[PDB]
Amino acid sequence: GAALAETTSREDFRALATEHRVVPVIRKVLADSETPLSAYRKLAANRPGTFLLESAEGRSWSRWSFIGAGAPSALTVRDNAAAWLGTAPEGAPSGGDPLDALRATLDLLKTEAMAGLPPLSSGLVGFFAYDMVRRLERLPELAVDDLGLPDMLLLLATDIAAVDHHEGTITLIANAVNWNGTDERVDWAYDDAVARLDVMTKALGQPLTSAVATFSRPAPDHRAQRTMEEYTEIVDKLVGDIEAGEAFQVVPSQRFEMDTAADPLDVYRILRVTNPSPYMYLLNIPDADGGLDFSIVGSSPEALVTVKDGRATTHPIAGTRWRDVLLEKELLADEKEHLMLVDLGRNDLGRVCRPGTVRVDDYSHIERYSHVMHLVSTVTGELAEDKTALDAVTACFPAGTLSGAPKVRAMELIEEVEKTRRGLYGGVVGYLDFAGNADFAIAIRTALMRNGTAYVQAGGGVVADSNGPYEYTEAANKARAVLNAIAAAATLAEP
Amino acid sequence: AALAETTSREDFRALATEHRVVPVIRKVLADSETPLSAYRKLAANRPGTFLLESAENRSWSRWSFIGAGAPSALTVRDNAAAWLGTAPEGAPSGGDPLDALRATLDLLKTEAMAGLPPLSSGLVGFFAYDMVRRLERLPELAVDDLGLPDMLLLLATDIAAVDHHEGTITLIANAVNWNGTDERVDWAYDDAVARLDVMTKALGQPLTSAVATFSRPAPDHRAQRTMEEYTEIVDKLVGDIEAGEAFQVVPSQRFEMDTAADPLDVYRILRVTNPSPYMYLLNIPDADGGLDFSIVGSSPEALVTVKDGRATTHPIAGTRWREEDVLLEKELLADEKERAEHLMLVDLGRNDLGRVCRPGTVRVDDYSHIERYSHVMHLVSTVTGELAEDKTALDAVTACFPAGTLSGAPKVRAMELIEEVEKTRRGLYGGVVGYLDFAGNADFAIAIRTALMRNGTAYVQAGGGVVADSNGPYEYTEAANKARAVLNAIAAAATLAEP
Ligand SMILES: [Mg+2]
Ligand SMILES: [Mg+2]
Ligand SMILES: [Mg+2]
């Protein structure tokens, strides 16, 4: 009767637009011969301003994957001020402090949750660099900024494809965004969104060449910033501070790099098959001319904070094992510090949540993924009425597991011992939606790919009993998870 | 080393000295393929191909299975076991089909090997309901107008196992050693590698889009019985139950419709509309290697599953449509209208597994748990036992066959009464669709919510249990609505189009 792919009607759109800043025009299609990756290849074609977000659950892949089909606009930092790349939307906040411009943007577009939509239907998708913390806390300026990344870059994801693995369907969404709050051009906005659905629908109609492949796992030819001896000097320095009482924990790191001609999407494919995680992402970041500035590809196992319907939640990980029930109780029985970070998170959420709503849940459960298992503690709370999801992000930022405790003192020492500004490393990758929700991964196990070079940073917590060579090795192993994927992706070939 | 490294000749040789069925395998990254796209590339609706998928208690299970094309099938011709296509040298044929099948499984029995997908070789296909006539003496009153064979099992030697979590496909080409000699080991290896290369080449091809819309028009269909005719049957059976002939009996009737739809398109509509633990598409070959007919279905209920010497059945007590979901669960748990009917079937399952299991191992868990799928939830019981040392998976299938759910209690009297009231032989309806693997395992769905598609006609049969308090009009409509689930899918499939 009604067709599966019936598009939101002009009449229904009109009625919503009288009440809502961001109105989705949607169309569902049967896509039972597509995967999230094949849909990405058709809809995004690896273009600048596109994205793919996937999530392993402990039941394999979650129901939904999200493709950003191509954002004409992105909110970033240029010459120390908020700026839009691509189209600067008329009436959208610009200039001045970037966090204020972002806050103003989210306030302007705040839209009531609507029933019948996929979990993410519009939003700002991208990253905060670790160095955004420099705007939340005063920190020295010693490390060299050789990567030149912006403190933030958020794609205005108005064209989204939501892939429903269970149903074998894709819900295409093209949002109308009412920046100025007028009623003047409702029909134009509907026709505009419908045209964008038609572009995505036509893209899905194209044939696709095979990507059925083999790959091998060669050693990555890569360079490191620190030798084992140099990293050992760092670790020993920090163990001194910890013994003298300056901090309880500090997380140093270093950066690794390798030459690669591999496509970022192929790197994503190797990470997906090798290191499936709750936060898989590929982001193609545009430069100011509409070309590709760089790509971010990562498989992060840990969130910073998730905000859903007023509730903020964090899952700091105590420990992890290689995945069988004896590895489990072997981790609950590790009394080897976790709860100092659970303490940091209790404080962090307390600053944005209603009094008494912040609950902790010591070692609440394990999380079994495909090739690993995690022991997590849960901290949740209810956001105050004058606090947004963005406030939750800034309150928690950066992860304590990526800085130390006390956080500010830990970050001061980090700045002292490291060579270069971290850039993305230890920041976050994720989204803020227009309904006030957010989900951000800690930016670890991530490559930054730019003009034939891949950068991979990794580190690890240093305490009083820490050994330099052991910590060097642990951190290099974390980096090698990504470097190995890049090396392997270069070998992809037809079988 | 390489992901797609093929089983080496030297490893194959070593295995071939101990094992009758030896897989040569090759795993590939196939993260832009789905089970349906892989089926379209590998099998392409050819005769002798199949697709098996399973929703799990609340996604698709890890593995989907494609039978990429079986040259050989074991069936029935002129009332005796016979192979279609290639009759393998030394393979059992003639006589009773269940004997020939038992002899085939005996010959090919091969230890489960580490590192393989869950189904790596076996016999895939169906038993018609009317196979029961070789197990029990029943009257011959109903007309056999479909002409189906009592069984047809594809010898599935070329399989593609699709791993949804990894995004990989494990291609398997089995070498089958019928005579047990080592004469032709290198030829067997080369033949398997060649089969792997055919499947690999097929996966390397481009593929046109299948992104689609469809609508849901009412199906133009025909029935055997009107409501009043069906009521006469129900009233007759209620009388037999009141008289003590039986506790419950499951009549049915056949529906049909014209269709030019591709059976895979029917499959696709069933898949998106009601994913079930047993989805299947089987393209059944005729004796000349053309397509005899296709079987497409989404059955919710197993006959029996045999894994590692343990036989289990899960009779469904009730179903609900899916926090308002918590209330439906509560309601489902508290609904007792059909409890006695369900417990009678649990009792039959105990009878059945008792015949093949080691005394003291048959365990019954009344109303053991709820199974949660995308659009429905099932309240189920469990009957399980350990097979006796002299009993095989096939003995468990035959002991359970046909399902009490599709016959009645006591089973033989119920089948006699079915034969008295139905117009036509059931054919596939009330039989099973599934597999027996070469390692002694089995998993069979009851053949319900299934279409048989042949030469532009689709047949869909459906029925339901009659008990002392049943009424004709209600039971007619409940069974007609079961059939309509499939007829509706067929009518919708004809509308599939580019959006
Ligand atoms: Mg440590
Ligand atoms: Mg009994
Ligand atoms: Mg009933």
| Most extensive chain-chain interface | A-B, 50 and 49 residues
Number of structurally distinct domains of chain A? 1
Assign the CATH class of chain A. Alpha Beta
Number of helices of chain A: 11
Q: Biggest β-sheet of chain A, characterized?
A: 11 strands, antiparallel
- The CATH superfamily of chain A is Anthranilate synthase
The CATH architecture of chain A can be given as: 4-Layer Sandwich
Instruction: Assign an overall shape of chain A.
Output: globular
Q: N-to-C terminal Cα separation of chain A, in Å?
A: 45 Å
Indicate the percent of residues in helices of chain A: 25-40%
CA radius of gyration of chain A: 22 Å
CATH topology of chain A: Anthranilate synthase
Widest sheet, order of strands of chain A: 1-9-8-3-2-13-14-23-24-12-10
Number of strands of chain A: 24
Description of the structure:
2 copies of one chain form a homodimer. The first copy, chain A, is of the alpha+beta class and about 500 residues long. Chain A has a single domain, classed as Anthranilate synthase (4-Layer Sandwich), CATH 3.60.120. Chain A has 11 helices and 24 strands. In chain A, strand 21 (about 430-435) and strand 22 form a beta hairpin. The longest helix of chain A is centred in the last third of the chain and has 22 residues, at about 470-490. Chain A is globular, with a radius of gyration of 22 Å. At the A-B interface, strand 1, helix 2 and helix 6 of A face strand 1, helix 2, strand 4 and helix 6 of B. Bound molecules: magnesium ion (MG) (3 copies). One magnesium ion binds next to loops of chain A.
